Design a protein around this ligand. Structure first.
Ligand code: GTP
Ligand code: CA
Ligand code: MG
Lengths: 167, 89
């Protein structure tokens, strides 16, 4: 049985912790607790095979940059999450993506771009096309709008990371 | 009263969390920080204790609640001191 090391990244409050807990535990954490670093193991079936997923929910700060080096070295697949309600959290995705490629010396890196909080449609600042345009920029990276609150496109994030590693 | 960031494995939930613990405070006070971090996801939570895994030159022990935290030196073989939350009864 294969183990997959997936890292969730992005600035604070985008919903990295809420997407991970919704996927792993089936509940919506409506509170905000600042994350230092949190891992979760869970065996799922993906494509008729049993997979052990190890999901690292990282901090959205430039604090703890020593352990940022660690998890991009060992990460196999990366979910880059922004909130559709805050323009800055999207803009800040670009610098992250390049740091992943630099510590991996290659751009063949499993990756998915996630627009979280798609359930807050009247508070939306970042359009679907913005994300689609970053995604294509990034050598046709996979792209999802998700909601951790409504459990839309949550497991789709981690399953596509897994299929990409198998590719 | 400045803190120390500690990684806490919880095997029965298959998760780890980095938490700020105070070293100059009792071990029960750190057990309580871990219980708040778990957010009522652990069944029978009072029956769990903080446990230091065996390491070089040192067997593993459940930490005693009366004793202060800083009176247990972290196993120096990881970037972050590591503790486990296990069932005892
Ligand atoms: N409405 C809505 N709120 C969400 C969604 N996902 C997360 N939130 C809320 O946004 C806040 C931030 O959630 P977190 O997951 O803790 O944010 P974060 O990305 O983990 O931030 P850090 O881990 O500390 O870096 C919380 O109050 C969540 O309930 C979502 O999909 N929809
Ligand atoms: Ca789904
Ligand atoms: Mg968080």
């Amino acid at each position: 049985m294969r183990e997959y090391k997936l890292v969730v990244l992005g600035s604070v409050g985008v919903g990295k912790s809420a997407l991970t807990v919704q996927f792993v535990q089936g509940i919506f954490v409506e509170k905000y607790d600042p994350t230092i670093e949190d891992s979760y193991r869970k065996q799922v079936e993906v494509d008729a095979q049993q997979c052990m997923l190890e999901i690292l929910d990282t901090a959205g700060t430039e604090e703890f940059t020593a352990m940022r080096d660690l998890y991009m070295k060992n990460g196999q697949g990366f979910a880059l999450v922004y909130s559709i309600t805050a323009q800055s959290t999207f803009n800040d995705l670009q610098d992250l993506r390049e740091q992943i490629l630099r510590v991996k010396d290659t751009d063949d890196v499993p990756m998915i771009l996630v627009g979280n909080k798609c359930d807050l449609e009247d508070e939306r600042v970042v359009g679907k096309e913005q994300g689609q345009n970053l995604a294509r920029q990034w050598n046709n990276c996979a792209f999802l709008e998700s909601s951790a609150k409504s459990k839309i496109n949550v497991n789709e994030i981690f399953y596509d990371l897994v299929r990409q590693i198998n590719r | 009263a400045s803190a120390v960031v500690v990684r806490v494995g919880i095997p029965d939930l298959q998760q780890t969390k980095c938490l700020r613990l105070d070293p100059a405070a009792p071990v029960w006070a750190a057990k309580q920080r871990v219980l708040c971090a778990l957010n009522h996801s652990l069944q029978d939570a009072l029956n769990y204790g903080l446990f230091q895994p065996p390491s070089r030159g040192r067997a593993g022990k459940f930490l005693d609640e009366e004793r202060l935290l800083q009176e247990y030196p972290p196993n120096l073989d990881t970037p972050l001191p590591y503790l486990e939350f296990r069932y005892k009864r």
